[PDB]
Design a protein around this ligand. Structure first.
Ligand code: FAD
Ligand code: NAI
Ligand code: NA
Length: 278
């Protein structure tokens, strides 16, 4: 009754990184989900059986798949399932839902356990497939203030970061000072580069930076390296006159969230200015 549902068509489902796919969904009749940036939807899947060997993984991203023999895996799901995924589009990107979905493979120290149910299903989807979503939901919303904003994302945590940043600069026409600090493992794992480069070129109040935590020899990389929290500290927060006056929004793997939070507390940032999704 109260929660709305849409039967969507898959527009595309391309790899954006070795272990991340961008699922793009078309909403029926060109309508839009009435969400807020930072929110999420629930995807549901029927019973199914999929093989990793059938995933479309481009050769550019296949290196670690071959290296760890990840095409061995199969996922057998006996009953319908449901999971949450965050919108990577912002609300005025009408008619679509964009998601960034990390494949949850078996842990390497435990390789024979079942692969992740829903991410394996999503990775099997191809253009033209149908996909049912409900919502929207969420609580990871921007504060309505004039404070400087610092966004920290890592890996698939890109999704709500993109939603938030575009919402501020395009829908809200914000003049707030904004920066985005994004951690990727190596150059091929970067994505949405055109999106944020364009925003920074058009908005004097927005800048962004990528740090590579494991740069590869073929990257010819001369930018920032290491964990993103160390890069943000060294190149911006260390010398900030008043880091406690900023609002920090972050989404990354658990160990990135913990390192960022620790660093901000050590700088005297208060918990009300440190925001994560639940
Ligand atoms: C609000 C919210 C927003 C989210 N947004 C996103 C998003 O934007 N993008 C995203 O990628 N995810 C997101 N997530 C996480 C997402 O919902 C899923 O939890 C994730 O995709 C994994 O689900 P799964 O069904 O693929 O894996 P599951 O089936 O839940 O399995 C999880 C992992 O456990 C492993 N495992 C299984 N059995 C065992 C065992 N016996 N021992 C050890 N390990 C085992 C699996 O191989 C897999 O690695 C979000 C979650 C929430 C709550
Ligand atoms: N809860 C939510 O709203 C959302 C959750 N996610 C989750 O985000 C996760 C992202 O994971 P991946 O893409 O595999 O990330 P990853 O392995 O590619 O790492 C991304 C970056 O995180 C940082 N990082 C990683 N390990 C670190 C450590 N030990 N210490 C400090 N920094 C570290 C590095 O800068 C690294 O480049 C996924 O598991 C996904 O489920 C994704 C989107 C939204
Ligand atoms: Na700029």
């Amino acid at each position: 009754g109260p929660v709305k549902k849409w039967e969507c068509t898959v527009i595309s489902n391309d790899n954006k990184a070795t272990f991340i796919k961008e699922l793009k969904l078309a909403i029926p009749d060109g309508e839009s989900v009435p969400f807020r940036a930072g929110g999420y939807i629930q995807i549901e899947a029927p019973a199914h059986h999929v093989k990793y060997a059938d995933f479309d993984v481009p050769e550019k991203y296949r290196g670690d798949w071959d290296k760890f023999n990840l095409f061995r895996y199969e996922s057998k799901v006996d009953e319908p399932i449901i999971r949450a995924y965050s919108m990577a589009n912002y609300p005025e990107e009408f008619g679509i839902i964009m998601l960034n979905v990390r494949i949850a493979t078996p842990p390497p120290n435990n390789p024979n356990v079942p692969p992740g149910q829903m991410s394996s299903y999503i990775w099997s989807l191809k253009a033209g497939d149908k996909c049912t979503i409900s919502g929207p939901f969420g609580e990871f919303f921007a504060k309505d203030t004039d404070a400087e904003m610092v966004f920290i994302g890592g890996g698939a945590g890109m999704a709500p970061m993109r939603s938030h940043i575009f919402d501020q600069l395009k829908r809200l026409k914000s003049k707030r000072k904004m920066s985005y600090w994004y951690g990727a493992r190596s150059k091929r794992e970067m994505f949405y580069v055109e999106d944020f480069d364009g925003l920074a070129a058009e908005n004097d109040n927005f800048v962004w930076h990528c740090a590579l935590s494991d740069p590869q020899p073929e990257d010819n990389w001369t930018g920032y390296t290491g964990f993103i929290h160390n890069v943000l500290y060294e190149n911006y927060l260390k010398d900030h006159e008043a880091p406690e006056d900023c609002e920090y929004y972050m989404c990354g793997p658990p160990m990135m969230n913990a390192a960022v939070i620790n660093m901000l507390k050590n700088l005297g940032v208060e918990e009300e200015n440190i925001l994560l999704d639940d």
